[PDB]
Amino acid sequence: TRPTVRPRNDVAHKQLSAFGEYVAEILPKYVQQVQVSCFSELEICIHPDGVIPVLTFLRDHSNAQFKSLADLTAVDIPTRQNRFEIVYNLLSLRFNSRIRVKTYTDELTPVESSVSVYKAANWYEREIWDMFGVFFANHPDLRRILTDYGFEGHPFRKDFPLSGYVELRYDDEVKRVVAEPVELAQEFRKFDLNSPWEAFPAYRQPPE
Amino acid sequence: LLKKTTGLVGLAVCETPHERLKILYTKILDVLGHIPKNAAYRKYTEQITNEKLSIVKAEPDVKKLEEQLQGGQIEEVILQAENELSLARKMIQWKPWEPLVEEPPASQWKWPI
Amino acid sequence: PLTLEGIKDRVLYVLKLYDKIDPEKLSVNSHFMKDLGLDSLDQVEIIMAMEDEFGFEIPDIDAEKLMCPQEIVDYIADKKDV
Amino acid sequence: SNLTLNFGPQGVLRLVMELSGEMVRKCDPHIGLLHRGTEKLIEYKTYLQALPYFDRLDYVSMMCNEQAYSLAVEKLLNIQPPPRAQWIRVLFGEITRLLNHIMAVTTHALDIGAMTPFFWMFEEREKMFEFYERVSGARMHAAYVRPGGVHQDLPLGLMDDIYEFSKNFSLRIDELEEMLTNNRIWRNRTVDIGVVTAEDALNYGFSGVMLRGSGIQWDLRKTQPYDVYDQVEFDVPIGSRGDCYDRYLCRVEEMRQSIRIISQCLNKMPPGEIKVDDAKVSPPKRAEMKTSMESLIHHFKLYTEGYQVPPGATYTAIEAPKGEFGVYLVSDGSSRPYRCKIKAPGFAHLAGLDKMSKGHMLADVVAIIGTQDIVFGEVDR
Amino acid sequence: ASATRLIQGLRNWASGRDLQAKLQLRYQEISKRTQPPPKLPVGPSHRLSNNYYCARDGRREAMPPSIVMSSQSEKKAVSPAPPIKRWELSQDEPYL
Amino acid sequence: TSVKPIFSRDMNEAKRRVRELYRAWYREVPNTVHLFQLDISVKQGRDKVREMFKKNAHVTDPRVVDLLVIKGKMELEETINVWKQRTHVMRFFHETEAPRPKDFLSKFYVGHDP
Amino acid sequence: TYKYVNLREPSMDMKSVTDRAAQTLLWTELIRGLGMTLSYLFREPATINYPFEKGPLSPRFRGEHALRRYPSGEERCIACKLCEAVCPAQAITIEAEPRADGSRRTTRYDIDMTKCIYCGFCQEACPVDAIVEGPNFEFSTETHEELLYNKEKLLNNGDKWEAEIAANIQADYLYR
């Protein structure tokens, strides 16, 4: 498996497993899972009440020192009762490392805003309001950032269509750009591309 | 040696880093004594703070203390000790050594679905 | 703000400028919800018309308890001397 | 009372200023004017089909974002490119870095008023777009760096022209630097302007020059290295005061060090293939597509279905010229992504615009919007 | 390259640099637009023996993420990696 | 079935928030018609605000009406601060749209849509 | 491995202080900038004489689409729909049926050139080299629907541009 296969880094794998044990035993109040991927990336799956205690720990503890917030993300998974999966990507410059902190919410439970810890989130989770509808409590200026001002709905929810429900055009009667129900000259053609043969036996889920 | 600048913008040069780190490390341990003993945060933070404080008490030089504390300039070691002190003062209020507040739902971290 | 008859007639003048209230059916003790047949937002904009006339901010906890114009004129009497 | 201005869209940006005469008390950038819903359209398209969206995010740093997405997909696939494809990726990534820093420095000088080095350096930028058109067929959006390597091998005589360009480009940097660096008017527009402390730069999620102008010694080509950046020799410029002038000097020195890297990549290009020799990921050659049965089946299934990526989530960050460019890719096991969050540096930089323009004036706002190299395609997605 | 030596000397004096050595206009020193045809090499998997795909499969050697902790002694405090080695200053041109 | 609240603890605090939001919109509508120089009357804009409040009147969940009050606050912030243009204000008045068929018979005549 | 830009201390002897004051009072670096701009005044400009002179291109260039034929007049396209399957913009719409001699051919082959992103996945997915993205970039129109090509327009593009398309494919197919 020399030329074409990506080489495994067992050193960083063992180090991130040890640090995952470390975070799981310092903070047992919120840490629900700790997992390390096969390409050596650490995920800390926590409870949504501990967004501020976990992220302030990793920012401030001298073995962690995750000073930088790289990215803040939500993922919509409609088969869960807590469909939204909030992802914090953190960068430690002292230990040259990256950690993923993952929590969850549904449409109505608010998540505590991490602008007290990382001010970078002041737009990021604001984006999560515009795109997903996840409210963030105790945010300084929470409003839409990317969609148009009168836009109803949250676009990156997976029950939201690819096109919108409204389209704009200039109307000369009212001398104004107006919104109308969307009608395409050609429908977006849904392709069914999934092969019916199993690709990865390692990821095989056990049946019922 | 009177290091003229730290290199980092907004971080001024501390004149006496040894006494400052000794005061901050003993204050970390004094705040950290209020945590129960079975908490892993107290044991780990006492361990790393005692290692750092023994290294500070072992060396009179600033620069060799920088090459053996292994944390960059001495002023950001001071700033990290301040961050650790504020963290321990928060960790007293949060009390995170307790058990898990709520089990997750059954397929909450199952991926792929 | 001086005489209670003037304040009561001014409250009735506000309510008779309000289009949805029947002027014949309107009395001093008539309830807004179950006599006059008004929405809650009708009563809310009545209270805002009273703030336009009398010129003082009425809070929320004591604007919900104003269910007849007698309670309104007694509230204005209690926020003044008369 | 105090003044409130609306510098509207007459990229593009809406600005709501709260001013106190000449000063700036509050800067609210209203964005979303180029929000096109890229990372929702990625969800319905395959990995090869989602590749050309990354060309159009940072549309002056095309092959860099191609490289970051290709590294994310190759990390989830557990495959690696051949060495020649890696040296080609680093070569064209540093050519892309020259493109982006010419765009950055010359438009930052154009907005302040120095309109001449714009025209002087876009001829060099025109020659590098000819390099892109020779390697891929399009001048800007190449769709060249793909998961598995690159799409097609270098045409014969391209490296001699990259040599002839790189031999002369340092004089172009020198005459740009002659026009601007020691110029007292350029220094008066950039020295006291937007001083960013290192702790607030780490806290605000800044990356790249926005960190390194403030003295933070962080470059992802050194610390978290990708394809062959541990095999090239270059220096990382570090600022001292965290202002617009140090960030200007950092970008000029990154052009210098990119020329150094391009010289080393021209002298160290290895022979070999340019795609991964797994034909279940990268497509076979057209000569063997038209002769072999397995290769025709793999051509059919890669250009209709695409490769299935194993289920998993990754955050792959590279050092784009604007900073840390990241792709958080979530794969559910199919041949289309489940999720693709696109971290771009300009979003966090434009979030920090409000702190960077406190206590400054109105004509310093254009200098601060210049020192953060803000392309609104990567900001609004 | 067509400028007379008076204009060329005025130009080199005004710039202060030797501009004919490094001209930003391209001339006959470029590659030919018509090239001889290539012969691209095959990769390492173009073999007729010892070339089973089950010994060079990348997508199927990737595993699900190993769960370190789940909710279903005097061990050392650890960091996610050793601390970052301090960068050495350049010897080429440190501006020092 | 025990959930974490957003702002309100029951329906009465939520109706307090709905009531204050309606008060703020009712005060804002004359300024909105004035500075956007809209062609509608003040009464017609107030009827549109009454229609948009009564559209969601069936909700009996405190968290849902909490998020509705928050989104009405965001719309009011985009109206007071001149962030919306005239087009965004007039998108509530679906003027250029055709009248939709209401009965069975005209919907039978025009197409297949129930 | 790092270098400090802008960490020089200026000298403080009378020589260098007088040098900096002469630079202040006599505007020496401003004269340096004037000298560089005067140097570019006496250069030959980089300006080509378009439309009579054209910018240099390569045989890989991705311009206007065309449908090629075999050297017997038979069109190469056999309706396999790989090009609309891989089209990242869904700009290609294909409909097919067997024609009168039983051949697998298209009845509809549309490319919306206003949807097209000009990335050439259709020419590299095509197993028979039928659709190509040829050399033409000067095909601007005065009307939007003139950029909505059907099969007849693309076959006329192939018949118009085959003498150049075949030479570009001849010059480039060994890299593919």
Ligand code: SF4
């Ligand atoms: S060039 Fe790309 S976008 Fe255009 S028709 Fe071909 S595959 Fe589609």
Ligand code: SF4
């Ligand atoms: S143009 Fe080529 S890829 Fe498209 S349907 Fe025809 S033969 Fe297939």
